[PDB]
Structure formats: C-alpha cells, structure tokens
Amino acid sequence: ICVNENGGCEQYCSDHTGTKRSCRCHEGYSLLADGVSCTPTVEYPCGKIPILEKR
Amino acid sequence: IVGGKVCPKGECPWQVLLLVNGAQLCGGTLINTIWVVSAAHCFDKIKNWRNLIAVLGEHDLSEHDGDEQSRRVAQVIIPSTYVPGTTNHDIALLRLHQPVVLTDHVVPLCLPERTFSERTLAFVRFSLVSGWGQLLDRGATALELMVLNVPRLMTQDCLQQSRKVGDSPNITEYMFCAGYSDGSKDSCKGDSGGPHATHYRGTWYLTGIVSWGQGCATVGHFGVYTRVSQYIEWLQKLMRSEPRPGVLLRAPFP
Ligand SMILES: CCOc1cc(OC(C)C)c(F)c([C@@H](Nc2ccc(C(=N)N)cc2)c2nc(-c3ccccc3)c[nH]2)c1
Numbered sequence: 076i077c078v079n080e081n082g083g084c085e086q087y088c089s090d091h092t093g094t095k096r097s098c099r100c101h102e103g104y105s106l107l108a109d110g111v112s113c114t115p116t117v118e119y120p121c122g123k124i125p126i127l128e129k130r
Numbered sequence: 131i132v133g134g135k136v137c138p139k140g141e142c143p144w145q146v147l148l149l150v151n152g153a154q155l156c157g158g159t160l161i162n163t164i165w166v167v168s169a170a171h172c173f174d175k176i177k178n179w180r181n182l183i184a185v186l187g188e189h190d191l192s193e194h195d196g197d198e199q200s201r202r203v204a205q206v207i208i209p210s211t212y213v214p215g216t217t218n219h220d221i222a223l224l225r226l227h228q229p230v231v232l233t234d235h236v237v238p239l240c241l242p243e244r245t246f247s248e249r250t251l252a253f254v255r256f257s258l259v260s261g262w263g264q265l266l267d268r269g270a271t272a273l274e275l276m277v278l279n280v281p282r283l284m285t286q287d288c289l290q291q292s293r294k295v296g297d298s299p300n301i302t303e304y305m306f307c308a309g310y311s312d313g314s315k316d317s318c319k320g321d322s323g324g325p326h327a328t329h330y331r332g333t334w335y336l337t338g339i340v341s342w343g344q345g346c347a348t349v350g351h352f353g354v355y356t357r358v359s360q361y362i363e364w365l366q367k368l369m370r371s372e373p374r375p376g377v378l379l380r381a382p383f384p
C-alpha cells in the first residue's frame with residue numbers, strides 16, 4: 076500500500092501483515108482520527124514556515 | 131545561486147550560514163535545535179576547528195537585525211567513506227555547542243524517513259536550493275539569501291543530457307542531478323552544504339545538499355547534490371549518540 080501514493084499518508088507510511096497500513100508523523104506532529112493527516116503539536120514544527128502559516 | 135531570487139526574510143528559516151574566522155564558508159540545514167546538515171567538502175581545508183560558527187535566522191549579511199543566532203560548532207561528523215578532495219559521500223553532520231531557540235525566523239527542516247524519501251519525495255519534480263553563493267559563475271557572492279526552484283532528474287537522464295567532459299567525476303547512488311542545462315539557473319560553490327528542500331502535502335523536507343558541478347550554470351551541465359535518503363539511518367544513529375572530545379569525528383558508513 077505505502078509504495079502507491081504514499082498509502083494515502085500525509086507523512087510516513089508503514090506496511091503491515093495483509094492489506095494493513097499505519098500512517099505516522101515526524102516528531103512535533105500527531106496523527107488525526109482519519110489515520111492519514113498530521114497536525115502540529117508544537118509552536119515551531121519542522122518544515123513549516125511561520126510567516127506563511129500565520130498569514 | 132544563479133538565476134534565482136532573494137528568499138523573502140523568514141521564508142528559508144532552516145538555512146544555516148557557516149563561518150570560519152568570520153568569513154563565509156558554506157551553507158547548512160538545521161534539522162532540529164542542535165543539529166545541522168552540511169557538506170563534508172566544506173571542511174577539507176579547516177585548521178582552526180574552534181573558529182567555526184553556525185548562524186541561524188540570517189538573511190542580509192550587511193546588517194544585524196536581531197533575528198540572527200550564532201552558535202559554536204561543537205562537532206563535525208563525516209562518514210568514513212568520504213575522501214577529502216573527491217566527490218562521493220559529501221555530507222557532514224554538525225552538533226551545535228548550545229541549541230538554537232526556535233522562532234518565526236529559525237525553524238528546522240524535516241529530515242524525512244528513508245522509505246518516504248525514496249518512494250515519495252524522490253518523485254517530487256521541483257525543489258528549492260538556497261544560499262549566499264555566487265550570483266554568477268566567476269562573479270560576486272550574494273548579500274541577501276537567494277533561492278532557486280530546480281527540477282530533479284534521474285541519473286540516466288542526467289548523463290544522457292550532459293556534455294561529455296573529460297576526467298568528470300562519476301554520479302554515484304549517493305548523488306543526484308538537479309537543475310537546467312541551458313546555463314541560466316544553478317546553485318554555486320559558495321552555496322555548498324546548503325539545502326535542497328522538497329515540498330510534500332504542506333511540509334518541507336531535506337532531500338539534498340549542494341555538493342558539486344562543472345562551474346556554475348554551465349551550458350550542458352546540471353547541479354549535483356548529495357542524496358540525503360542514503361544517510362537517514364547514519365544521521366539518526368549519530369543524533370542519539372553522546373558527544374565525543376574533539377571537533378572532527380569520522381564515523382563508520384554504513
Ligand atoms: C565534493 C565536492 O566536490 C566538488 C567538486 C568540484 O568540481 C568537480 C567538477 C571536480 C567543485 F567545483 C566543487 C565546488 N562546489 C560546487 C557546488 C555546486 C556547483 C554547482 N554547479 N551546482 C558547483 C561547484 C567547490 N566548493 C568548494 C568549497 C566550498 C566551500 C568551502 C570549501 C570549499 C571548492 N570547490 C566541489
């Protein structure tokens with residue numbers, strides 16, 4: 076699943092036994108209940124531009 | 131950077147400026163509050179290891195605006211496979227003596243997982259390359275941080291689209307080509323060590339390091355970047371390790 080369109084994950088993807096897939100996030104983010112989206116948990120998460128984010 | 135534009139202040143917040151005795155040395159990429167990724171070749175001619183400074187939140191070299199944060203570089207980690215004066219394995223991992231403070235102007239770039247970088251990021255066509263390097267080949271360096279959007283090429287396509295120059299170094303699996311062959315846009319030697327940053331679903335990641343090329347924006351040639359995906363596990367293991375006395379450290383690769 077992960078090899079195809081990142082398994083639908085916004086960030087990291089792990090393949091499991093069968094058609095099972097777990098999305099994951101970089102530190103400073105949490106996975107949403109959709110199981111694909113990553114939301115920041117810190118004021119300055121990596122790879123985001125504050126002046127553009129706050130705009 | 132040749133043929134780019136000024137990166138608006140705060141829009142390249144992971145950009146690092148490396149200084150030796152206050153003189154511009156190289157670029158770098160902040161990946162968390164204490165670690166910087168740069169190019170190993172930046173350090174081939176260093177003698178005064180204690181005079182090496184990393185500057186975060188830098189934008190304009192002619193003025194101090196208060197957003198700049200300077201830190202001494204406590205450690206420079208180079209893979210054992212890197213040979214000074216050669217092109218392969220061009221990566222260095224730097225530990226800052228004290229963490230930088232994250233602010234609107236100082237933010238780390240995400241170091242991606244290897245699988246995500248190889249299967250997804252490697253297929254994003256365009257990425258940004260940045261630095262205070264030469265504005266032209268054999269020209270002056272920039273006072274304001276510059277940024278350029280470059281397309282990535284498969285190595286087979288890079289070699290077929292390139293002008294066959296004698297004694298040219300091989301493009302290994304630890305490198306990738308990005309840029310243009312028309313001589314209008316490229317990163318330059320003074321941008322060495324700087325980020326090649328890739329956007330994916332609202333987040334930016336580290337995919338490359340400004341490494342080498344034939345001149346700067348030379349017709350028939352592309353920029354060559356260190357393929358960061360090959361070093362993820364090597365970087366992660368070192369970031370979890372205790373500091374060791376002495377600035378330079380050669381660490382086994384793989
Ligand atoms: C492993 C490095 O291998 C190198 C091999 C080179 O030439 C081959 C063809 C043999 C070469 F020109 C370089 C220069 N870098 C550079 C970077 C980007 C481009 C580009 N067009 N995108 C072109 C050239 C350079 N950077 C420095 C440098 C930079 C800071 C502190 C200390 C030294 C010295 N030289 C590096």
Ligand SMILES: [Ca+2]
Nearest residue numbers: 190191193194
């Ligand atoms: Ca400044």
